[PDB]
Amino acid sequence: RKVIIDDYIGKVTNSYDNKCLLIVAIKSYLEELEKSALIESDSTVEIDFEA
Amino acid sequence: AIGLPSINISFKELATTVKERSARGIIAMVLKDAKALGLNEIHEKEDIPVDLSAENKEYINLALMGNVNTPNKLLVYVIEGEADIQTALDFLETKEFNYLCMPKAVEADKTAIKNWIIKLRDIDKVKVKAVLGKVVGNHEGIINFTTEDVLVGEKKYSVDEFTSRVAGLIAGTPLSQSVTYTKLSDVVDIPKMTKVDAESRVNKGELILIKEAGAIRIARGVNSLTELTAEKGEMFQKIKIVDTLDIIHSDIRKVIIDDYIGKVTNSYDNKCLLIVAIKSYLEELEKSALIESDSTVEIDFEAQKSYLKSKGVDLSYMTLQEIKEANTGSKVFLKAKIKVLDAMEDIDLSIEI
Amino acid sequence: RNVMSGTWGELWLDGNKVAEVKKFQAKMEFTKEDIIIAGQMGTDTKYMGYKGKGSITLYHVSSRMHKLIGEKIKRGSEPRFVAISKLNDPDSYGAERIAVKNIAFDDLTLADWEVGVKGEIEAPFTFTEYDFLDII
Amino acid sequence: RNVMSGTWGELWLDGNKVAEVKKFQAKMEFTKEDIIIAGQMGTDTKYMGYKGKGSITLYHVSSRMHKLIGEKIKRGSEPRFVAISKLNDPDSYGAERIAVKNIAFDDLTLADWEVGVKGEIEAPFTFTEYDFLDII
Amino acid sequence: NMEARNVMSGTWGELWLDGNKVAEVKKFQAKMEFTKEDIIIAGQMGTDTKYMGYKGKGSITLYHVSSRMHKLIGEKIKRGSEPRFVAISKLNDPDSYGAERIAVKNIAFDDLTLADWEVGVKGEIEAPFTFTEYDFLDII
Amino acid sequence: NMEARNVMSGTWGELWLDGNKVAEVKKFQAKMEFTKEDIIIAGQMGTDTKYMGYKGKGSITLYHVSSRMHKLIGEKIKRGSEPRFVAISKLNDPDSYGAERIAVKNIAFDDLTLADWEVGVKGEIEAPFTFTEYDFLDII
Amino acid sequence: NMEARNVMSGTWGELWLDGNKVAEVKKFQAKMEFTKEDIIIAGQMGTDTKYMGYKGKGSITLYHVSSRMHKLIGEKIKRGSEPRFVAISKLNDPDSYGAERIAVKNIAFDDLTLADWEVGVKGEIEAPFTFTEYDFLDII
């Protein structure tokens, strides 16, 4: 929540490329959490197709 | 004429700037004072008239702060203590601008300003907007900012006085970005407001301030328009989309009014030529990624139908092509469809354990 | 029911009406590649693109093409144009217009004449994109 | 309005007026290369040069071509000429003239005749640059 | 299932180099060459191999619209420092089943073409490179 | 942005050799070949390379209008002294975004062609060379 | 200055071999191959070369009008003595700026063709050689 609020709300245009960049940022945060051995290393992020 | 041969070397230190001003964004301020009457454009801080009072100085400095870039230019009009607003508005009609703000005003004068803005937008088809204190207008060209007792520094600024800072912040925002959740460093504190009341207030259609996350920030970038017709869209409430649309509308004027007004016979072939020209113009805007692709320009069928029905024409048993071929005297009706991308303002993340 | 006759044809080139025009023609030719799929006798095709081709034929009333492209061709810069064709037969129910954009001409005819024959000029061209106005 | 008839055509070759000329023709053919741009179905072209081509057709009144080029062709040096074409139909409003420079002839016809047929000679040529006089 | 329309076409690809989209691209190719050693095992006629590593190779060919390749590495090469880049290739055909995207990392270029032109010929520039790492993004 | 007309054409180039403009030029090419050594690092399958230097190569092809190439080096080569030249190439297409100019320095030629002719064939002379340094002038 | 007609044509050449004009000549070619060694100088990335010498090579192709090549060297080769010849090539095109003439000296031939024929094919004989010296006569 803090990461999203700080840099993405209102400062980027809602395009597909910006969505991919945000996905990459979230994936990078999860990979950072990986090295501390809090969760598992199979994490995947993608667009919620059904919603 | 010819002079002696000359070799001159000039040294200049063109590096004296910070927070450079944007090319776009023009703000017009009209004020009541006893001195410096008339228009006094203000390019930057160093050129400020000295005869003005402290209140006008404070308002101008409030309007001189932007979001990322400073506004391109400021047009300050000074009126005498007892005067009507009609003369100032008539003088400002000649000038061009994007936003107009009134720091000191009364309830009745706001009505005159709103009526003038509505008439200018509709009758004259000139796309300008105004920022007003407490006006409940239902038009996209009106922005009402309705939070009180802003504590900037050690003064309880009024809502109308802070409309100047609101207008400056709006003008400073780049085209790509929006004004949602932008932090105001100068502001200290806001009067208490519960979350649900603020949400309902912004739902009604209002410009407010809230305390969220680190500091104070603008809740939403909605407009004053609160009801939607079938023709009107839900995207017309956002300020950024309206700003881009008005920029485009003003830009197409150098194609339309410069050449096709009073110089070309009004025939359906010339209408088709003008449509082709407008579409070719829109292609360049698409290629710069300002708007989305697949933008269509074509004859406004419904407005032309209404105008034909206004005069003595029996619209029955006429072909649609026959309707389009009709000569509408000396007026042309056109309709365009373009799309503008909005900024990220809502996120829904779902996590599976 | 009647089929439109080409007598009622008008052409606009570069924003100027072409008074003399004998015929006009524009076509889009597709590019396909043969693909053979295992287990099937019939051969299928994959569409990979298209090309635009056409031509004009007009009487030699004036020196239009030279004033259009002559000096720029020598200089080294090739201009592009937009042409509009309209076909409106009064017998038929409706009219048809098409806008052809990004036109480039294949050649230039300086002079051509013969004894006892009225002059005619035909100039092929290639285009990229088209837009439709007043579809039937 | 009238279209120019080719009966009123005159040709000057190498500064001498050619009394007998059946037809004259000069054309510029462009050179283009296909270029495919990623993300676009339509194919675009780039203009890379041009070539000048033409021909003359004249009755076999005299031995003009031999006196022009015959000995120099054998010697090994190829001459270049300048030709002027004028088309002035009295019915039409104005006249038209073109100067064609750096002309080189493709072939030479020593003799050609048949029983009961009047002789005709046609000589194609290639040129590089042209200049325009009395543009309509 | 299988049909002619499903085959991907190269006209629909695009390439990002160092975060900047390259519009004047003609072709892009990346590959990994494995290293294998022959091992003869007593009692069996057929020879078997052992995998030891891989080597990555590729190339980019693009129209000579602008002098892009010089500004990247021309001055750095002379001084003695070699830069490394990241490339992203996306292949999005409307007929095929979606699109596939791949990031190629640690790219180092093989040569720099200062000038290449000929009369009557349009200009083109091809640059080969080698890489070490890669990611899979939205693979089909 | 990207369009077909923006591609540079070779017909619009020109070449200066030793301060004298060469008008009978057919093509000009220059290139730099980097030198890279394979390095295997323990724990990683992908091989990585180290950049050590570059080598410059190129060639010029020109119509046999006159015996220009002889007068430059013919007598000097026999005596035992090797000259060094400087070449400038400019590519100025009206349709493209401006022009790019490059100076190639320390040029030394590979061979000299005394005579080359065949019946019915136009004459041409191609000369390859090697260089060491270069400058950028008005790069796009 | 530069024009198409100025380009020399091979039809206008002629060749003198051992003082006797050769009329049945198809093509003549001479070249000088320099010898250069790579030298790496500390502190500079670009490699530089040092010139050490040259090697001369060429060939002559002529129609098989007569058995000219045998009478020159056929009997001498078997005995163990190698002759040396002198060739002069003149290229005189009326359109170009005059003519250029070159003398190639110390010519030694590489091979001798006793017989070469095939049904339905006209006969031709090509002979390569190597030389050491040259002169310039009436260079343009």
PDB file of C-alpha atoms in Angstrom, chain C residues 7-130:
ATOM      1  CA  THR C   7     -20.056   9.372 -66.584  1.00  0.00           C
ATOM      2  CA  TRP C   8     -20.920  10.911 -63.194  1.00  0.00           C
ATOM      3  CA  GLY C   9     -17.408  10.825 -61.804  1.00  0.00           C
ATOM      4  CA  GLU C  10     -15.463  13.639 -60.154  1.00  0.00           C
ATOM      5  CA  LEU C  11     -11.936  13.739 -58.756  1.00  0.00           C
ATOM      6  CA  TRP C  12     -10.233  16.093 -56.299  1.00  0.00           C
ATOM      7  CA  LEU C  13      -6.428  16.054 -56.292  1.00  0.00           C
ATOM      8  CA  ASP C  14      -4.432  17.923 -53.629  1.00  0.00           C
ATOM      9  CA  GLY C  15      -7.502  19.987 -52.764  1.00  0.00           C
ATOM     10  CA  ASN C  16      -8.074  21.106 -56.368  1.00  0.00           C
ATOM     11  CA  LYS C  17     -10.891  19.789 -58.540  1.00  0.00           C
ATOM     12  CA  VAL C  18      -9.663  17.963 -61.642  1.00  0.00           C
ATOM     13  CA  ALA C  19     -11.916  19.190 -64.443  1.00  0.00           C
ATOM     14  CA  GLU C  20     -10.735  16.651 -67.043  1.00  0.00           C
ATOM     15  CA  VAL C  21     -10.662  13.011 -65.957  1.00  0.00           C
ATOM     16  CA  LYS C  22     -11.385  10.053 -68.215  1.00  0.00           C
ATOM     17  CA  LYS C  23     -11.125   7.267 -65.632  1.00  0.00           C
ATOM     18  CA  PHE C  24      -9.915   6.617 -62.098  1.00  0.00           C
ATOM     19  CA  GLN C  25      -8.974   3.344 -60.435  1.00  0.00           C
ATOM     20  CA  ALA C  26      -7.615   2.310 -57.035  1.00  0.00           C
ATOM     21  CA  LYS C  27      -7.059  -1.215 -55.751  1.00  0.00           C
ATOM     22  CA  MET C  28      -5.603  -3.018 -52.733  1.00  0.00           C
ATOM     23  CA  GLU C  29      -3.617  -6.189 -53.450  1.00  0.00           C
ATOM     24  CA  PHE C  30      -2.936  -8.638 -50.629  1.00  0.00           C
ATOM     25  CA  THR C  31       0.207 -10.641 -49.882  1.00  0.00           C
ATOM     26  CA  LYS C  32      -0.213 -14.327 -49.033  1.00  0.00           C
ATOM     27  CA  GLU C  33       2.158 -17.194 -48.263  1.00  0.00           C
ATOM     28  CA  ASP C  34       1.498 -20.873 -48.893  1.00  0.00           C
ATOM     29  CA  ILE C  35       1.456 -23.005 -45.741  1.00  0.00           C
ATOM     30  CA  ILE C  36       1.258 -26.806 -45.830  1.00  0.00           C
ATOM     31  CA  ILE C  37      -0.115 -28.465 -42.690  1.00  0.00           C
ATOM     32  CA  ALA C  38       0.687 -32.097 -41.938  1.00  0.00           C
ATOM     33  CA  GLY C  39      -2.203 -34.469 -42.553  1.00  0.00           C
ATOM     34  CA  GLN C  40      -4.214 -32.217 -44.890  1.00  0.00           C
ATOM     35  CA  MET C  41      -4.263 -32.315 -48.687  1.00  0.00           C
ATOM     36  CA  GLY C  42      -5.643 -28.805 -49.100  1.00  0.00           C
ATOM     37  CA  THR C  43      -3.094 -26.012 -48.893  1.00  0.00           C
ATOM     38  CA  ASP C  44      -3.838 -22.976 -46.731  1.00  0.00           C
ATOM     39  CA  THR C  45      -2.540 -19.413 -46.887  1.00  0.00           C
ATOM     40  CA  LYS C  46      -1.424 -16.794 -44.368  1.00  0.00           C
ATOM     41  CA  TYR C  47      -2.039 -13.091 -44.993  1.00  0.00           C
ATOM     42  CA  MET C  48       1.093 -10.999 -44.439  1.00  0.00           C
ATOM     43  CA  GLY C  49       0.264  -7.538 -45.794  1.00  0.00           C
ATOM     44  CA  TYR C  50      -1.101  -5.551 -48.699  1.00  0.00           C
ATOM     45  CA  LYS C  51      -0.127  -3.049 -51.383  1.00  0.00           C
ATOM     46  CA  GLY C  52      -2.063  -0.131 -52.855  1.00  0.00           C
ATOM     47  CA  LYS C  53      -2.049   0.492 -56.595  1.00  0.00           C
ATOM     48  CA  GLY C  54      -3.964   2.646 -59.039  1.00  0.00           C
ATOM     49  CA  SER C  55      -3.818   5.095 -61.909  1.00  0.00           C
ATOM     50  CA  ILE C  56      -5.459   8.149 -63.465  1.00  0.00           C
ATOM     51  CA  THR C  57      -6.245   9.019 -67.083  1.00  0.00           C
ATOM     52  CA  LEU C  58      -6.856  12.638 -68.052  1.00  0.00           C
ATOM     53  CA  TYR C  59      -6.733  14.784 -71.168  1.00  0.00           C
ATOM     54  CA  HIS C  60      -3.748  17.052 -71.802  1.00  0.00           C
ATOM     55  CA  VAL C  61      -5.583  20.301 -71.132  1.00  0.00           C
ATOM     56  CA  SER C  62      -2.828  21.858 -69.008  1.00  0.00           C
ATOM     57  CA  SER C  63       0.556  21.167 -67.412  1.00  0.00           C
ATOM     58  CA  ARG C  64      -0.694  20.008 -64.025  1.00  0.00           C
ATOM     59  CA  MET C  65       1.719  17.171 -63.217  1.00  0.00           C
ATOM     60  CA  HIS C  66       4.820  19.282 -63.836  1.00  0.00           C
ATOM     61  CA  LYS C  67       3.631  22.112 -61.589  1.00  0.00           C
ATOM     62  CA  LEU C  68       2.864  19.411 -59.027  1.00  0.00           C
ATOM     63  CA  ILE C  69       6.066  17.388 -58.795  1.00  0.00           C
ATOM     64  CA  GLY C  70       8.689  18.458 -61.346  1.00  0.00           C
ATOM     65  CA  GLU C  71      11.119  20.618 -59.387  1.00  0.00           C
ATOM     66  CA  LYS C  72      10.795  18.581 -56.189  1.00  0.00           C
ATOM     67  CA  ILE C  73      11.623  15.377 -58.077  1.00  0.00           C
ATOM     68  CA  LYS C  74      14.875  16.889 -59.347  1.00  0.00           C
ATOM     69  CA  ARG C  75      15.743  18.363 -55.948  1.00  0.00           C
ATOM     70  CA  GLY C  76      15.511  14.972 -54.243  1.00  0.00           C
ATOM     71  CA  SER C  77      12.366  15.249 -52.093  1.00  0.00           C
ATOM     72  CA  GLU C  78       9.272  13.262 -53.051  1.00  0.00           C
ATOM     73  CA  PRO C  79       5.877  14.817 -52.241  1.00  0.00           C
ATOM     74  CA  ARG C  80       2.778  12.954 -51.097  1.00  0.00           C
ATOM     75  CA  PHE C  81      -0.812  13.874 -51.928  1.00  0.00           C
ATOM     76  CA  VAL C  82      -4.427  13.091 -51.063  1.00  0.00           C
ATOM     77  CA  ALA C  83      -7.068  12.370 -53.709  1.00  0.00           C
ATOM     78  CA  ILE C  84     -10.854  12.171 -53.363  1.00  0.00           C
ATOM     79  CA  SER C  85     -13.118  10.369 -55.834  1.00  0.00           C
ATOM     80  CA  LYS C  86     -16.893  10.814 -55.952  1.00  0.00           C
ATOM     81  CA  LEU C  87     -19.382   8.676 -57.891  1.00  0.00           C
ATOM     82  CA  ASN C  88     -23.015   9.856 -57.794  1.00  0.00           C
ATOM     83  CA  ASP C  89     -25.331   8.484 -60.471  1.00  0.00           C
ATOM     84  CA  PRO C  90     -28.747  10.203 -60.266  1.00  0.00           C
ATOM     85  CA  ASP C  91     -30.516   6.956 -61.183  1.00  0.00           C
ATOM     86  CA  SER C  92     -28.879   5.065 -58.314  1.00  0.00           C
ATOM     87  CA  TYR C  93     -30.108   5.573 -54.767  1.00  0.00           C
ATOM     88  CA  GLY C  94     -27.000   7.015 -53.112  1.00  0.00           C
ATOM     89  CA  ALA C  95     -23.514   8.369 -53.699  1.00  0.00           C
ATOM     90  CA  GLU C  96     -20.044   7.117 -52.800  1.00  0.00           C
ATOM     91  CA  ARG C  97     -16.828   8.930 -51.863  1.00  0.00           C
ATOM     92  CA  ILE C  98     -13.378   7.633 -50.932  1.00  0.00           C
ATOM     93  CA  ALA C  99     -10.310   9.471 -49.653  1.00  0.00           C
ATOM     94  CA  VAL C 100      -6.957   8.039 -50.760  1.00  0.00           C
ATOM     95  CA  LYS C 101      -3.980   9.220 -48.726  1.00  0.00           C
ATOM     96  CA  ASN C 102      -0.184   9.058 -48.965  1.00  0.00           C
ATOM     97  CA  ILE C 103      -0.157   8.969 -52.765  1.00  0.00           C
ATOM     98  CA  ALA C 104       3.111   8.733 -54.692  1.00  0.00           C
ATOM     99  CA  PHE C 105       3.290   8.899 -58.486  1.00  0.00           C
ATOM    100  CA  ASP C 106       5.239   6.353 -60.516  1.00  0.00           C
ATOM    101  CA  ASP C 107       6.316   8.527 -63.452  1.00  0.00           C
ATOM    102  CA  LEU C 108       6.085  11.915 -65.157  1.00  0.00           C
ATOM    103  CA  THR C 109       5.183  12.522 -68.813  1.00  0.00           C
ATOM    104  CA  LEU C 110       6.866  15.630 -70.201  1.00  0.00           C
ATOM    105  CA  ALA C 111       5.430  15.613 -73.722  1.00  0.00           C
ATOM    106  CA  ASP C 112       3.584  13.139 -75.938  1.00  0.00           C
ATOM    107  CA  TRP C 113       1.743  13.959 -79.157  1.00  0.00           C
ATOM    108  CA  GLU C 114       0.987  12.534 -82.590  1.00  0.00           C
ATOM    109  CA  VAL C 115      -0.505  13.877 -85.805  1.00  0.00           C
ATOM    110  CA  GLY C 116      -4.296  13.705 -85.796  1.00  0.00           C
ATOM    111  CA  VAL C 117      -4.603  12.463 -82.197  1.00  0.00           C
ATOM    112  CA  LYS C 118      -5.766  14.366 -79.125  1.00  0.00           C
ATOM    113  CA  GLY C 119      -3.332  14.105 -76.233  1.00  0.00           C
ATOM    114  CA  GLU C 120      -3.962  11.848 -73.242  1.00  0.00           C
ATOM    115  CA  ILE C 121      -1.959  11.440 -70.031  1.00  0.00           C
ATOM    116  CA  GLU C 122      -2.077   8.473 -67.660  1.00  0.00           C
ATOM    117  CA  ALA C 123      -0.111   8.411 -64.401  1.00  0.00           C
ATOM    118  CA  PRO C 124       0.028   5.312 -62.175  1.00  0.00           C
ATOM    119  CA  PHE C 125       0.440   5.754 -58.439  1.00  0.00           C
ATOM    120  CA  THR C 126       0.820   3.815 -55.194  1.00  0.00           C
ATOM    121  CA  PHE C 127      -0.925   4.552 -51.897  1.00  0.00           C
ATOM    122  CA  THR C 128      -0.880   3.270 -48.320  1.00  0.00           C
ATOM    123  CA  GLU C 129      -4.086   4.123 -46.433  1.00  0.00           C
ATOM    124  CA  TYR C 130      -7.644   5.036 -47.383  1.00  0.00           C
TER     125      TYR C 130
END
